[PDB]
């Protein structure tokens, strides 16, 4: 009603929903209840090690590689992680990879 994004994906999927989704599910909660200002520790309660676990899942979907964990998340929020990921893909090189076994 106020924004175009709104809960869940904006149109098809939206990188924003990808991060929030992976985070929400990793926090033992739905993506519809995931707050945009929910820290990866204050609320989501995701240790530095836990964050990297879900962060790797996002990069894979966004089609990244080295983007895995752009910066500290212990003090970041879903909006920051989602924005950082969406930013990279928004202007990333012509590189790609799979990397299995994990």
């Amino acid at each position: 009603m106020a924004r175009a994004d709104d809960t869940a994906l904006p149109a098809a999927t939206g990188a924003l929903e990808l991060v929030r989704h992976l985070v929400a599910e990793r926090a033992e909660l739905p993506v519809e209840v995931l707050r945009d200002d929910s820290r990866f520790l204050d609320d989501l309660h995701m240790s530095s090690i836990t964050v990297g676990q879900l962060v790797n899942e996002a990069a894979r979907a966004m089609g990244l590689s080295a983007v895995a964990m752009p910066t500290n998340f212990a003090t970041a929020t879903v909006r920051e992680m989602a924005e950082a990921l969406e930013a990279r893909e928004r202007e990333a090189p012509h590189l790609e990879h799979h990397h299995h076994h994990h």
Side-chain angles (χ1 to χ4, degrees):
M1 50 161 56
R3 48 257 141 76
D5 310 339
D6 187 69
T7 3
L9 45 115
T13 337
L16 218 303
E17 115 75 22
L18 208 150
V19 150
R20 278 170 70 196
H21 185 29
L22 293 183
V23 177
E25 300 230 303
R26 277 254 97 80
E28 220 89 310
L29 23 118
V31 61
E32 76 116 88
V33 82
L34 213 289
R35 322 187 90 180
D36 325 279
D37 307 297
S38 73
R39 312 216 102 162
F40 308 108
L41 279 184
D42 208 304
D43 252 77
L44 311 165
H45 279 115
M46 313 247 234
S47 305
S48 58
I49 301 305
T50 298
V51 196
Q53 306 250 62
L54 88 90
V55 162
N56 268 240
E57 184 59 78
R60 181 109 106 164
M62 304 308 316
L64 321 190
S65 162
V67 179
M69 320 211 60
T71 190
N72 201 42
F73 281 119
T75 180
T77 40
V78 300
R79 192 78 87 164
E80 280 208 331
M81 178 196 279
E83 267 38 275
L85 274 177
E86 98 83 67
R88 314 242 48 75
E89 54 86 3
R90 171 185 141 181
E91 190 112 291
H94 59 97
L95 198 138
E96 191 154 300
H97 222 85
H98 186 94
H99 186 226
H100 65 106
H101 189 218
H102 66 297

